[PDB]
Enzyme design. Structure first.
Site, mmCIF file in Angstrom:
data_model
loop_
_atom_site.group_PDB
_atom_site.id
_atom_site.type_symbol
_atom_site.label_atom_id
_atom_site.label_comp_id
_atom_site.label_asym_id
_atom_site.label_seq_id
_atom_site.Cartn_x
_atom_site.Cartn_y
_atom_site.Cartn_z
ATOM 1 C CB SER A 140 -1.075 0.032 1.618
ATOM 2 O OG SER A 140 -1.613 0.918 1.197
ATOM 3 C CD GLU A 254 6.879 -13.825 -25.243
ATOM 4 O OE1 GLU A 254 6.173 -13.211 -26.080
ATOM 5 O OE2 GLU A 254 7.555 -13.802 -25.436
HETATM 6 N N1 LIG Z 1 -7.515 -2.750 -0.844
HETATM 7 C C1 LIG Z 1 -6.481 -2.847 -0.098
HETATM 8 N N2 LIG Z 1 -6.646 -0.982 0.647
HETATM 9 C C2 LIG Z 1 -6.620 -1.767 2.041
HETATM 10 C C3 LIG Z 1 -6.483 -3.191 2.104
HETATM 11 N N3 LIG Z 1 -5.850 -2.578 3.861
HETATM 12 C C4 LIG Z 1 -5.192 -1.884 3.884
HETATM 13 N N4 LIG Z 1 -5.059 -0.774 2.839
HETATM 14 C C5 LIG Z 1 -4.958 -0.064 2.527
HETATM 15 O O1 LIG Z 1 -3.575 0.487 3.167
HETATM 16 C C6 LIG Z 1 -4.077 1.725 3.038
HETATM 17 C C7 LIG Z 1 -3.416 2.577 4.719
HETATM 18 O O2 LIG Z 1 -2.265 2.050 5.078
HETATM 19 P P1 LIG Z 1 -2.442 0.217 6.737
HETATM 20 O O3 LIG Z 1 -2.305 -0.945 5.138
HETATM 21 O O4 LIG Z 1 -3.886 0.261 6.955
HETATM 22 O O5 LIG Z 1 -0.760 0.998 6.492
HETATM 23 P P2 LIG Z 1 0.797 0.178 6.703
HETATM 24 O O6 LIG Z 1 0.541 0.443 4.590
HETATM 25 O O7 LIG Z 1 0.929 -0.756 6.470
HETATM 26 O O8 LIG Z 1 1.546 1.163 6.862
HETATM 27 P P3 LIG Z 1 1.328 1.313 8.499
HETATM 28 O O9 LIG Z 1 0.333 2.537 8.229
HETATM 29 O O10 LIG Z 1 3.089 2.063 9.355
HETATM 30 O O11 LIG Z 1 1.568 0.550 9.007
HETATM 31 C C8 LIG Z 1 -5.126 2.486 3.418
HETATM 32 O O12 LIG Z 1 -5.997 3.547 2.964
HETATM 33 C C9 LIG Z 1 -5.971 0.955 2.467
HETATM 34 O O13 LIG Z 1 -6.279 1.770 0.560
HETATM 35 C C10 LIG Z 1 -7.358 -4.421 1.736
HETATM 36 O O14 LIG Z 1 -7.145 -4.937 2.400
HETATM 37 N N5 LIG Z 1 -7.564 -3.752 0.240
#
Ligand SMILES: Nc1nc2c(ncn2[C@@H]2O[C@H](COP(=O)(O)OP(=O)(O)OP(=O)(O)O)[C@@H](O)[C@H]2O)c(=O)[nH]1
Ligand SMILES: Nc1nc2c(ncn2[C@@H]2O[C@H](COP(=O)(O)OP(=O)(O)O)[C@@H](O)[C@H]2O)c(=O)[nH]1
Ligand SMILES: Nc1nc2c(ncn2[C@@H]2O[C@H](COP(=O)(O)OP(=O)(O)O)[C@@H](O)[C@H]2O)c(=O)[nH]1
Ligand SMILES: Nc1nc2c(ncn2[C@@H]2O[C@H](COP(=O)(O)OP(=O)(O)O)[C@@H](O)[C@H]2O)c(=O)[nH]1
Ligand SMILES: [Mg+2]
Lengths: 439, 430, 49, 108, 430, 430
Positions: A140, A254
């Protein structure tokens, strides 16, 4: 003989890894514990699962992947869930303190004690594989540890391995609906990090998938599980050609050979069809022409972008099921005839067609209806500059008044890093503009 | 006894050769286990042209199987008639070509050609008196185009006086399956004219067109397209394996079809062809076979032969028939269509008769024609090539293996000169 | 305009030269036939040592 | 161009109405023989399709299954003789003996 | 040997052609499977006139079926004797004509006529010695009257010397099935006079009238009229297929029936037609046959023969008889009806004899006559045309597809001139 | 020798003149800078018909460009092939006419005609023996029609014997550009009937029809329309510059076509004209060349030739063809369509043959025919004008400039007289 390694960093990366790995286990018939239960399994050359799994020397199969996070909650949940016995205990690296939505913490301060373990485990996985095709990265962008460790790991792997292909299914923030508040900063910083260190980048915005689920599956309250399942289906459709028989098959070398014209431009968006529920699955023919026509609609893009505002440069299409080359050729002829979708002048032909015999599989408890045809889209288009423009517009609003920057500067990052990131993102935006003009 | 070895590379090359050996085995009555189960002695007299001899009385083809990935040869070994192929003949790499001409012609092609060339040398020298080579490959692919033309260059250097035949498949803009096809198509065509004695162009657009229109089958498949190509392949060398009223080998056809050494591109077709629901309403006679032979839609090429002038033509007949009708029918078609034949070469048609028809038939015809209308294929391919090349699209892949733009530049000039040469001879009067 | 006349006239005065002599694979086969046909005499008249 | 109706009443029996011909027309007897033959053919297979007319359309064609030596014996098509189950892992690769190497030779 | 090819279009034309081919197959003893099951050798000596030959000894008619809508050909294929026709000779569109002359002659007819013209050319070049063409179509319909006459113009331009016949079903006011009949009827009548060498005009009203008096059957059907027309068509060409004492081919009819180039509209008839009750109570002799022949109610046209004078007439006898009796009867009838024959031409009746009567009959006579009474059939059509065109009714359908009302104006004018020049001889004396 | 000079007027004339000189230069091989680039000697045999010798060997046309606004000259000079013209021949006013026939004829013309007459007299006396003048203009505008008709009026009295031809783009009501089109058109015809020896009417409506139907191109422009006129314009003087079997200069056509002095308005057409995607087949022989010539659609006038009778016709053939077939086809069309030809000129068609075909074409032909159909165009303009003259609107500006209603009344009466004396010959009988 051919293998790929999946890398999952960040909470979003892990929550997508869960879905894609459960889908892979169900596809290859591996039970959640880890052992094939058919009891009719034989030896010889039936090792079609070696792309993802590997024999454990006694019984089970261990996936070729690692999980990274500096916050132990999600990894402990994985270690407690029903997939506890599948993953190797040591290949789930967990930290102690979260990055707390900060790029500097996950890139300069606390990522250095985890990156060494990550490289050690990746090497211990890579020496096992003999035909390693490349790496897949899930993270993310709009998250602290996600962006930071993704940046550091990509930089380290670029020099550790070099010519191996790297594909990234990253998640940029949505243009207006977002959770965090400081996501433009680490978003642009990670954009710089991945600009010159990845080979293919795929856009995976969230409200686009929300709209897709609401329109097609008739679900008024989707959650992250549905999004992860759709992304898992996309990944399986992309990777299917490696491990199943087909008339026209493709590989990792590919894809990028026929999809990126220049080394700088490799940002692209994906689409899927058909997305349908059980109730509507009855009353539709689901022909190849119909599904291909639905695949090019702007509302079906996995990123919140409108390709009608720009030109295309390439299109890689993968079919699975019982499609035929003459029907797919007629469908491409109709698409080329259509005037709403327009290509660039210096690309007379722009279609790469892969056909696979294996129909898509269905996960019990899922949402997608069980069908015998499906098509996946990986399109590179000039209209992708909108998403970079919107992130740039948000960044300036806060950087003019220098909001939140004390936290970024108190962790060792110099102030000029923001200026360098803005300059390079602006340079990237200009390149996408000059490519689409006519001779 | 003037035998020929078989060489095939790439996915398209392997599948065509996988069915060609199936038709020939049926023609000579060889079961998939390798044992002769024919009916007549003519089926066994000239068996050495294709099949070698092994212990136990089983026959083995002299075919060489090459590709840069192991995926394709797994399929050819598992298919029918796949137990007739030598395990030692298979030569494969573990990386692939990646639809890149440079990758399959400079880096992996060079490092693998040593192994396959040793097989070619051992296969060729084992025979008492070689006759020539025939190659089946695709010009739109990576390993079929790149390392395939690299072997042709090497073979011509070590075996100068032999005959080189190529059943080539070029891509058409209508049915396109690759974005980078114009690059690796033009580069191969430049190399093809260098060494190949005979070139026989094939298009999937034409092969599809026949199935929808002529055979009237609703769902064509690559297996159906391969059968048409394989049927024509056995036809061109029919009389070399069986007796006949008049004999003609591969070298003889080259003499009567090549007015100039650079004009060695042919277009081929096969007759008769009729849909399943219309077979009972058609009478098979020499007039009917020759009427279908010159039809424009019957060609295995996308070029229209009535947009140009034939330079030379040839027709091989199968089955028992009268030489009087064969001679006069070719006379009639030349008289009625004097506008489609250039006027400075009188009597520009060749006849040949073999008395053994293909299995399950009574009369068959194979047509090979040299025409100036083939140039419109290279015109449209070069049309797409210059559109991509002016912007230097996808060029970083090709430059990454040492190839410079000079090779791209000289491929344009040589291709243009060949096109310019065909037009000039059509625009010539006594 | 008069030097244009002269230049164009002299460049036009050169046109009819074709002499079809394309020889890349034919020449390679030709030089092999001549070698084997001529070097047999040189092989067979060599003086023993 | 007409509705073939046969009943006991002579004004609507066709054959009774079309008997003014100098001969016996070869359309009515052919139709009756075709009806009987289609009935027998349906009995051989078993269709009972709610009326005899449903299967009459394709029980009269003379199209043979195979070729009769006026075209290449390619058959009706590869797709015609194909069967399809849909269990997971059905179309996985097989890796025949030609490409299954083990010991990775070291010298050249 | 002087064989003819058959072309049929439209629903009415297809029905007539199907019934006619049924009758011919019955006469020649051909089963629905195409296998000869005759008893006399005379049934095979001239089979090539109407039938070709194919593999297995099965005979295929050389007939061509064309239409714009697949409704009727799907029915004729499924009907009895529908397997005789070659499946490749079925050419059809998908839109239909909708009873509009322009739709079948300008846009949809022109785009589709290329394929049918190619088929006609192939069939005509295949046969040894072409003798002529015969057409069955309807003048009051959309696709028939338009596409058939366009094909008529094309084939007459392409083959200038071969004789040509038409069997046209022109609409009549008493039995009307469409409101736009006068328009396309007048247009086709205009277009036919310059190309058709012989026209056999037919009405549905006359056939119904014959069925209700002579046949005395309570419930006739379209099949009966079809079979009457088929019997007349078969009787036209009896002598060209069977031996006789005075053989007369189709050209011999034209020379004896056409005094002036623009006078070629005939009316045909058949004999003997007997009621079901009086089948065995009637004797078959030459005087009875000629009496029924020159009975005015036995014609297949609404025009009354007694309202004008015959120019020329021809009778084609079949079966075994005495030449003296036939000639004596012709002389007797011509002398007793002297006022009904134009005086300035002597002995304007021709008789021909064939040695084979129809299947199950002893003697039969086909009568073809050229008389001035045809003026009434065209007069009544033009009467409707002007009364409808003065208000420009239903005319935007025609003018909405590229046609101008100047075409209607010219077509009406040519019909009036034809009637005037045809009827001038009713009054002119030597 | 027998030289003719070109003068073009108005915006329409300059646009037509710009393409015409590009067309002629391409035919005779003159580059944009005025230097010869042809290949044959015949390209200079009669080059003096349209060009003058300049120092250094350059050729320049005899064109005098006149207008009331410089917006046309500075646009046609800057375009391609605009350097040929001599700047001294550029004459233009400084105020503009404003689509006012009175302004272009009475107040602003009178002071500027001093300049044009000086230059035109210089060009006329420069040639050794003058042949005639040719003028291009339109009767819908003010400057083109106003000073136009005045210009012919005076140059006629200096040269009462030399021939005068003009090309007239008469406006059409269905596609109209100016509200005052009936006014200035009626006045222009009055001044043109008694002055010009030859006049050709051109309808812009027909030009759209030809491009849409025969050419089948989606989007036409004013450039394409100018190309259609120039091609027909050039072919009239084809034999004046090149040898032929029956050369026929302008005076020859003038004598043969006009039976009476007041009937000198012509319609023209060109053939062959094929679609953009013309397939390579056959060749344009005379029978199809003459069929497209007399087609009513191919005419470039709104007057339908089938509404009246042809007084006479003339054809200008280009290419190497036999005279016999050319002669007999004209007899063929006369006999077949005798209704459209006046009976009191036997053999009322003239033919000419030129050996030099148009560039890139095998055979071509140009048609110039005088038919009684043009009375419709006069009749429809008169109805509009008399509707626009009763209102007495837009008249006070014509009236407030030196003239009154007397001229309009005498113009309408004379134009009515022309139509009446033009219809009497249509209905006249011999
Ligand atoms: N599509 C999707 N996005 C996710 C999911 N889980 C978290 N996100 C994305 O992650 C973003 C927030 O960051 P987190 O994933 O909660 O935490 P991180 O990216 O590991 O960074 P930290 O907060 O420091 O732990 C949100 O804006 C979401 O867009 C998921 O299950 N599906
Ligand atoms: N006619 C024919 N064409 C084929 C067949 N298999 C593949 N092709 C064509 O070959 C092209 C791909 O060639 P490719 O496999 O990449 O060649 P390679 O990389 O050298 O092995 C496709 O566009 C197909 O249309 C076949 O069996 N028959
Ligand atoms: N004798 C006969 N006449 C028919 C038959 N079917 C239709 N007709 C006549 O044909 C006319 C209609 O013509 P139509 O078939 O619609 O012309 P088309 O649309 O050009 O094919 C009607 O007036 C009928 O009288 C038939 O089976 N036998
Ligand atoms: N064929 C042709 N007609 C034209 C062109 N320009 C204008 N016209 C016609 O001329 C009419 C207007 O004439 P106008 O320009 O006022 O003539 P002017 O007063 O001399 O400038 C319009 O109805 C147009 O149809 C042209 O380039 N070609
Ligand atoms: Mg976290």
């Amino acid at each position: 003989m051919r293998e790929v390694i999946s890398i999952h960093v960040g909470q979003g990366g892990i929550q997508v890894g869960n879905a894609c790995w459960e889908l892979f286990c169900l596809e290859h018939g591996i039970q959640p514990d880890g052992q094939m239960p058919s009891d009719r399994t034989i030896g010889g050359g039936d090792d079609a699962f070696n792309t993802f799994f590997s024999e454990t020397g006694a019984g089970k199969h261990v996936p070729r992947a690692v999980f990274l996070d500096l916050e132990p909650t999600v990894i402990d949940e994985v270690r407690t869930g029903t997939y506890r016995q599948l993953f190797h205990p040591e290949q789930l690296i967990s930290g102690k303190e979260d990055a707390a939505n900060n790029f500097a913490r996950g890139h300069y301060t606390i990522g250095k004690e985890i990156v060494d373990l990550c490289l050690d485990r990746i090497r211990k996985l890579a020496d096992n594989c003999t035909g390693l095709q490349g790496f897949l990265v899930f993270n993310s962008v709009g998250g602290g540890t996600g962006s930071g460790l993704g940046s550091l790991l990509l930089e380290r792997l670029s020099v550790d391995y070099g010519k191996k292909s790297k594909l990234g299914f990253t998640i940029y923030p949505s243009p207006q609906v977002s959770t965090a508040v400081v996501e433009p900063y680490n978003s642009i910083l990670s954009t710089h990090s991945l600009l010159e260190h990845t080979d293919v980048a795929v856009m995976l915005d969230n409200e686009a998938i929300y709209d897709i689920c609401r329109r097609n599956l008739d679900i008024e309250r989707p959650t992250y599980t549905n999004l992860n399942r759709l992304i898992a289906q996309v990944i399986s459709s992309l990777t299917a050609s490696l491990r199943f028989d087909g008339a026209l098959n493709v590989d990792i070398t590919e894809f990028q050979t026929n999809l990126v014209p220049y080394p700088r431009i490799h940002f692209m968006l994906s689409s899927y069809a058909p997305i349908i529920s059980a109730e509507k699955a009855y009353h539709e023919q689901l022909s190849v022409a119909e599904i291909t026509n639905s695949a090019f609609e702007p509302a079906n893009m996995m990123a919140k972008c409108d390709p009608r505002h720009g030109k295309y440069m390439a299109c890689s299409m993968m079919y699975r099921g019982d499609v035929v080359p003459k029907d797919v050729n007629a469908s491409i002829a109709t698409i080329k005839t259509k005037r709403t979708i327009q290509f660039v002048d210096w690309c007379p032909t722009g279609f790469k067609v892969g056909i696979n015999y294996q129909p898509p599989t269905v996960v019990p408890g899922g949402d997608l209806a069980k069908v015998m045809r499906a098509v996946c889209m990986i399109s590179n288009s000039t209209a992708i500059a909108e998403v970079f423009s919107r992130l740039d517009h948000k960044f300036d609003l806060m950087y003019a008044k220098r909001a939140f920057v004390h936290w970024y500067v108190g962790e060792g990052m110099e102030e000029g890093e923001f200026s360098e990131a803005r300059e390079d993102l602006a340079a990237l935006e200009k390149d996408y503009e000059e490519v689409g003009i006519e001779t | 006894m003037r035998e020929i070895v078989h060489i095939q590379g790439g996915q398209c090359g392997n599948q065509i050769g996988a069915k060609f050996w199936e038709v020939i085995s049926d023609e000579h009555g060889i079961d998939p286990t390798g044992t002769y189960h024919g009916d007549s002695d003519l089926q066994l007299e000239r068996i050495n042209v294709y099949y070698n001899e092994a212990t136990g009385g089983r026959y083995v083809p002299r075919a060489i199987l090459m590709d840069l990935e192991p995926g394709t040869m797994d399929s050819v070994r598992a298919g029918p008639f796949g137990q007739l192929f030598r395990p030692d003949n298979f030569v494969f790499g573990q990386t692939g070509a990646g639809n890149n001409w440079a990758k399959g012609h400079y880096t992996e092609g060079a490092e693998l050609i040593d192994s396959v060339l040793d097989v070619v040398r051992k296969e060729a020298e084992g025979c008492d008196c070689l006759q020539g080579f025939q190659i089946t490959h695709s010009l739109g692919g990576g390993t079929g185009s790149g390392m395939g033309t690299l072997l042709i260059s090497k073979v011509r250097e070590e075996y100068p006086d032999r005959i080189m035949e190529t059943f080539s498949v070029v891509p058409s803009p209508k049915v396109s399956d690759t974005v980078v096809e114009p690059y690796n198509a033009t580069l191969s065509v430049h190399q093809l004219v260098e060494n190949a004695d005979e070139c026989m162009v094939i298009d999937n657009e034409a092969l599809y067109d026949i199935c929808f229109r002529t055979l009237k089958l609703t769902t064509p498949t690559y297996g159906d397209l391969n059968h048409l190509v394989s049927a024509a392949m056995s036809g061109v060398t029919c009389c070399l394996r069986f007796p006949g009223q008049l004999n003609s080998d591969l070298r003889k056809l080259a003499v009567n079809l090549i007015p100039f050494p650079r004009l060695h591109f042919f277009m081929i077709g096969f007759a008769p062809l009729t849909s399943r629901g219309s077979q009972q309403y058609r009478a098979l006679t020499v007039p009917e076979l020759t009427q279908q032979m010159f039809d424009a839609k019957n060609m295995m090429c996308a070029a229209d032969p009535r947009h140009g002038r034939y330079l030379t033509a040839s027709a091989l007949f199968r089955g028992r028939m009268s030489t009087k009708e064969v001679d006069e029918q070719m006379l009639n078609v030349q008289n009625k269509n004097s506008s489609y034949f250039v006027e400075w070469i009188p009597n520009n048609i060749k006849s040949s008769i073999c008395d053994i028809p293909p299995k399950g038939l009574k009369m068959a015809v194979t047509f090979v024609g040299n025409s100036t209308a083939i140039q419109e294929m290279f015109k449209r391919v070069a049309e797409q090539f210059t559109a991509m090349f002016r912007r230097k699209a996808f060029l970083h892949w090709y430059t990454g293996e040492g190839m410079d733009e000079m090779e791209f530049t000289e491929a344009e000039s040589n291709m243009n000169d060949l096109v310019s040469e065909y037009q000039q001879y059509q625009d010539a009067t006594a | 305009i008069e030097q244009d006349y002269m230049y164009r006239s002299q460049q036009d005065s050169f046109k009819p030269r074709l002499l079809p002599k394309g020889n890349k694979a034919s020449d390679l086969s030709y030089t092999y036939t001549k070698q084997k046909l001529s070097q047999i005499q040189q092989n067979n008249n060599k003086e023993l040592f | 161009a007409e509705k073939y109706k046969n009943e006991q009443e002579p004004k609507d029996n066709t054959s009774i109405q079309r008997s003014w011909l100098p001969y016996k027309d070869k359309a009515l007897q052919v139709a009756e023989n075709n009806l009987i033959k289609n009935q027998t053919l349906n009995q051989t297979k078993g269709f009972t399709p709610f009326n005899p007319l449903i299967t009459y359309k394709n029980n009269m064609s003379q199209v043979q299954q195979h070729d009769i030596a006026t075209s290449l014996p390619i058959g009706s098509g590869e797709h015609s003789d194909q069967k399809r189950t849909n269990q997971p892992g059905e179309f996985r690769h097989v890796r025949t003996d030609v490409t299954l190497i083990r010991n990775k030779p070291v010298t050249k």
